[model samples]
Target: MSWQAYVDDHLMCEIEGNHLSAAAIIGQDGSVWAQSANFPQFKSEEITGIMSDFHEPGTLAPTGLYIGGTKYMVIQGEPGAVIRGKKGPGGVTVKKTNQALIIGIYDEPMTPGQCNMIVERLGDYLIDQGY
Candidate 1:
């Protein structure tokens, strides 16, 4: 499947937080992949803390759950947020500058091949959603 199709499928994401949006996906092994992109690899034992204690329109560091930074985050989802420059409340934008290797919930991590498989199959599953 194509990249856009793949993104639309398998991945469950939405725009939220008043120009802020959050997204997450489940890897092959049922581990959760969640982030606001403002904090690329926002992984914490406490999801609430990750949400409240960090800066917006950016990303946080990786947690103990994720390993092998490259294989971990794998750019599954993109987060968008509204930021302010010299002024307050600027335009709406998706995070593109900071491509971080952030992964969360890796009690049982997924192999690179497994992650590729998930990306592939998820696109097909999303296509089937119409039925």
Candidate 2:
């Protein structure tokens, strides 16, 4: 299947059953392939920036989880403040590919362990595809 079809089908199907809020597949050069509706327009850029921060030294060093051959930066936010004014926990999961990146965000809180397993499963699939 095409990459877009995989993202729309497998990726969406895998996470939709969870607490998914938004998701996207971005090219390594920052081109957006797909993103959910109602999600922020600049989400890909924001996630790209976060990925860079993860590699930075010392003070700005961001923590993340590794899945298969991918390293995913864990990002937290309170999107509800802008959507409904109810501030709560949220998360962003990112994995880089040879030619693109996969980003998944949760509107509600999700434990790091849970996020790790989810990302690892997807990352393994991508790796198997030789991406």
Candidate 3:
């Protein structure tokens, strides 16, 4: 299945603003697998920045999680963007050898549980597809 189909099937409800926000599946080499047309396509430099964030040194990388049976790097942020007076969350989950699922909705908000479920389930799905 296409990445957009997968996201719509499993990850859409978890997203706040839906397709109007930024979302994409970025390959390990920064390829754009799928993305919402509402936002600009992610640049290679942007992908690099995100990967750097996930790989940044720390006792436990902020963008880290264990879903299904493998570890993943989970990325979420708002930078300075806000919605309803609160910072909205947008991010990606990067598998060790595959790609990253990026969600960027600075206007819509998602709970941590919602975000985690998307990351966990989607990561598992991508792994199953051998992506």
Candidate 4:
């Protein structure tokens, strides 16, 4: 259930989960691109002190959601990379893959509902990061 859930949104989410080796960012009618070293950075809260959103917890430091504007960083256990940053020659300079979700579009052309709205805003930022 993690083929980037299908991709869209002009590219921008930098890393998702599941499992990956490298193979996304197709485009040219193929589709997939959301640029940013192909996802996986997670360490925000002004820089990870833990505490972005908490209802009744002790430390809720978690805030990562950048599907289209770029700047996504949420590396859970480390398994994904290459969100449109790997494919050279005609594509020219691009390579970064672990595999769960990495379509990083940032060369030129883009569409297909903007790479499925950056894969539905990274599935609404992983269902509000519940997973």
lDDT of 4: 0.30
Q: For residue 80, what is the lDDT in candidate 1?
A: 34
User: Which candidate comes out best when scored by lDDT?
Assistant: 2
lDDT (Cα, tens digit) per residue for candidate 1, span 24-127: 33232324444333423434343332232223323433331122121222132332311111112211111111221112121112233333233334433443
Error of 2 at 75 (Å): 6.8
Candidate 2 per-residue C-alpha lDDT over 6-114 given as tens digits, one digit per residue, 9 for 90 to 100: 5566555544346455556666666678766543555424444544543442211244433222333433421211000111355555665556666665545544444
RMSD per candidate (Å) reads 15.3, 9.1, 9.4, 14.2
State in Å the error of residue 49, model 2. 2.6
How far off is residue 16 in model 3, in Å?
11
As a whole number from 0 to 100, the lDDT of residue 79 in candidate 4 is 18
**102 Cα displacement, candidate 3 (Å):** 4.6
Compare candidates 2 and 4 on lDDT and give the better one: 2
Best by TM-score: 2
TM-score of each: 0.21, 0.59, 0.54, 0.21
The whole-model C-alpha lDDT of candidate 3 against the native structure comes to: 0.45
Candidate 4 RMSD to the real structure: 14.2
* After superposition, candidate 2 runs with Cα above 4 Å error: 14-17, 43-48, 54-88, 109-112
Candidates in order have lDDT scores of: 0.27, 0.48, 0.45, 0.30
Error of 3 at 45 (Å): 2.4
TM-score of decoy 2: 0.59
For model 1, the stretches where C-alpha displacement exceeds 4 angstroms are 1-109
